[PDB]
Write a protein that binds this ligand. Structure first.
Ligand SMILES: c1cnc2c(c1)NCCC2
Lengths: 156, 39
């Protein structure tokens, strides 16, 4: 299968035609996506198979072929870019200044950008091109708009 | 059966479209990984 670093669509042929259920990141031989995209199922890459290696429903993250490799963090001050990969559409960068999710366990950056559910797993990057988290787990605020957490895993 | 297809490189784009606001929200995260607003 294709092991080149970069952003990938996650597709299924179980439903009508070929449907994009999410997106993920290949980095250092490991595939990274949100748990709600794959539900922890195995994935195909050409004739090859990717097996889950680590996952956590509460963090809403999963890694395949090895442990979670992404460890960059939002600096709390600068604009970032969502590398949105929408269903049936070309990868596109969107720059934004994150907001904050304040929780009883600390604060997390959040991006107020609304894309189709199949865009879940798209990477959020800093100015060095490092992935600071994945887009697609968030909340719907008063005015009906979507705000995603910048969800990042731990590199053991 | 799920499969992956490459969509691009991961790089910062100079002069990308700039949008979105920056809301500061009080939220709760449950055991199922669902975020909710605390009001
Ligand atoms: C973009 C990414 N994920 C989601 C949405 C949008 N909307 C609904 C909940 C999941």
């Amino acid at each position: 299968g294709e092991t080149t670093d970069g952003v990938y669509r996650v597709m299924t042929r179980r439903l009508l035609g070929s449907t994009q259920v999410g997106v993920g990141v290949m980095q250092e031989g490991v595939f990274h996506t949100m748990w709600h995209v794959t539900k922890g199922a195995a994935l195909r890459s050409g004739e090859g198979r990717l097996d889950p290696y680590w996952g956590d429903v509460k963090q809403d993250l999963v890694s395949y072929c090895g442990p979670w490799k992404l460890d960059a963090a939002w600096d709390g001050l600068s604009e970032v870019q969502l590398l949105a990969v929408p269903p049936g559409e070309r990868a596109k960068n969107i720059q934004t200044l994150p907001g904050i999710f304040k929780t009883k366990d600390g604060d997390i950056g959040a991006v107020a950008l609304d894309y189709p559910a199949g865009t879940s797993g798209s990477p959020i990057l800093d100015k060095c091109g490092r992935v600071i988290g994945l887009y697609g787990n968030g909340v719907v605020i008063k005015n009906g708009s979507y705000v995603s957490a910048i969800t990042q895993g731990k590199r053991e | 059966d799920m499969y992956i297809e490459r969509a691009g490189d991961i790089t910062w784009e100079k002069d990308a479209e700039v949008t979105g606001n920056s809301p500061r929200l009080d939220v709760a995260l449950d055991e199922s990984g669902d975020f909710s607003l605390v009001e």
